[PDB]
């Protein structure tokens, strides 16, 4: 049965910023979710200004993978919902965090670090080099993805060392970035993917959308729900 994916987007820039609305008139979430649906996923969206930011228990309980984009309103996501999502990831829900989502409460909580970085908005070139060429996330991608204009993020990226580094970006201005990183938290699989500044049509680039689709598939839950913790009796005789 199709993997069920919820694409969550702060959905502030596209309402109010002319240059962004021109690129994403129905929001970045609509673009990503449309692509995913046309790729066979059961795709829905959620935004910050819906009740419970669209992430009710009912929604999350039928969500296999959550995709997250935020930027200027990270602080408005309520702690109750962050905790709810955190619990679901640890139980096995997948999480794909995009671009400025590195500063989301949920990603910072999972990482345990500041998730800070260097950055510059200069309409500069990015080339995302594949460094895990057999990884399912890079199926169909070529040796790199090139973006003619993006916002630079630069090392040092204050994240725990990834389980795997999939992409490393080169930027025109001299920096590099670990731009595709996987992590596992509990049963959940997380993929950080750097591209997607709101003022560039990055989410219309077919290789970008394909990485996201590939990542949704890679992140799907396997044994969602079942771990026993706590006080336990012995499985073998203990000798006095």
| Window 65 to 94, contacts with Zn ion (CB under 5 A) | none
Judged by CB under 8 A, does residue 75 bind its own copies? no
Pick one of Zn ion, its own copies, none as the site partner of residue 100 (Cβ within 5 to 8 A by kind).
Answer: Zn ion
Tell me which DSSP letter residue 164 carries.
Answer: E
Helices (H), 39-78: 57-61
What's the closest the beta carbon of residue 124 comes to its own copies, in angstroms? 5
Which residues, including other chains, have CB under 8 Å from residue 177's CB and lie 6 or more apart? Answer: 117, 152, 153, 154, 155, 157, 168, 169, 171, 194
Judged by CB under 8 A, does residue 15 bind its own copies? no
Total site size for Zn ion, rule CB under 5 A: 3
Structure tokens at 126: 């990015």
Pick one of its own copies, Zn ion, none as the site partner of residue 58 (Cβ within 5 to 8 A by kind).
Answer: none
Pick one of its own copies, Zn ion, none as the site partner of residue 143 (Cβ within 5 to 8 A by kind).
Answer: its own copies
Q: Which is nearer to its own copies, 58 or 229 (CB)?
A: 229
Shortest CA distance to 28 belongs to which of 12, 16, 50?
A: 12
Judged by CB under 8 A, does residue 235 bind its own copies? yes
Distance CA 92, CA 206 (A): 28
| Window 145 to 174, contacts with Zn ion (CB under 5 A) | 151
Judged by CB under 8 A, does residue 72 bind its own copies? no
Beta strands in 70-212 (DSSP E): 94-98, 118-130, 144-154, 164-171, 176-185, 188-193
Q: Which is nearer to its own copies, 101 or 188 (CB)?
A: 188
Stretch binding its own copies (CB under 8 A), from 15-23, 31-39, 159-167, 194-202 = 159-167
Q: Which is nearer to Zn ion, 151 or 175 (CB)?
A: 151
CA distances from 215 to 25, 159, 222 (A): 25, 19, 14
HSE-CB of 154 using CA atoms within 13 angstroms: 11
Distance CA 175, CA 194 (A): 14
What does the per-residue mask of binding to Zn ion show for 186-215, with x meaning CB under 5 A? -----------x------------------
Judged by CB under 8 A, does residue 40 bind its own copies? no
């Amino acid at each position: 049965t199709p993997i069920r994916v919820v694409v969550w987007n702060e959905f502030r820039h596209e309402k109010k910023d002319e240059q962004v609305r021109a690129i994403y008139p129905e929001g970045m979430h609509t673009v990503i979710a449309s692509y995913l649906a046309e790729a066979g996923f059961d795709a829905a969206t959620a935004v910050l200004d819906e009740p419970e930011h669209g992430l009710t228990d009912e929604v999350l309980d039928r969500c296999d993978v959550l995709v997250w984009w935020g930027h200027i309103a990270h602080d408005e996501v309520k702690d109750e919902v962050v905790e709810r999502v955190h619990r679901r990831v640890l139980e096995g829900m997948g999480l794909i965090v995009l671009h400025s989502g590195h500063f989301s409460k949920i990603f910072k909580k999972l990482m345990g670090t500041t998730c800070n970085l260097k950055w510059r908005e200069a309409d500069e070139k990015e080339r995302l080099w594949v460094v895990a060429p057999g990884h399912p996330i890079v199926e169909g991608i070529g040796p790199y993805i090139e973006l003619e204009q993006e916002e630079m993020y630069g090392e040092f990226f204050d994240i725990p060392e990834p389980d795997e580094t999939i992409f490393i970006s080169w930027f025109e201005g001299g920096e590099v970035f670990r731009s595709g990183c996987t992590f596992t938290r509990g049963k959940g699989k997380i993929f950080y993917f750097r591209p997607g500044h709101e003022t560039y049509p990055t989410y219309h680039h077919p290789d970008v959308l394909k990485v996201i689709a590939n990542a949704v598939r890679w992140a799907a839950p396997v044994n969602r729900g079942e771990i026993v913790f706590g006080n336990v009796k012995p499985l073998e005789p203990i000798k006095a």
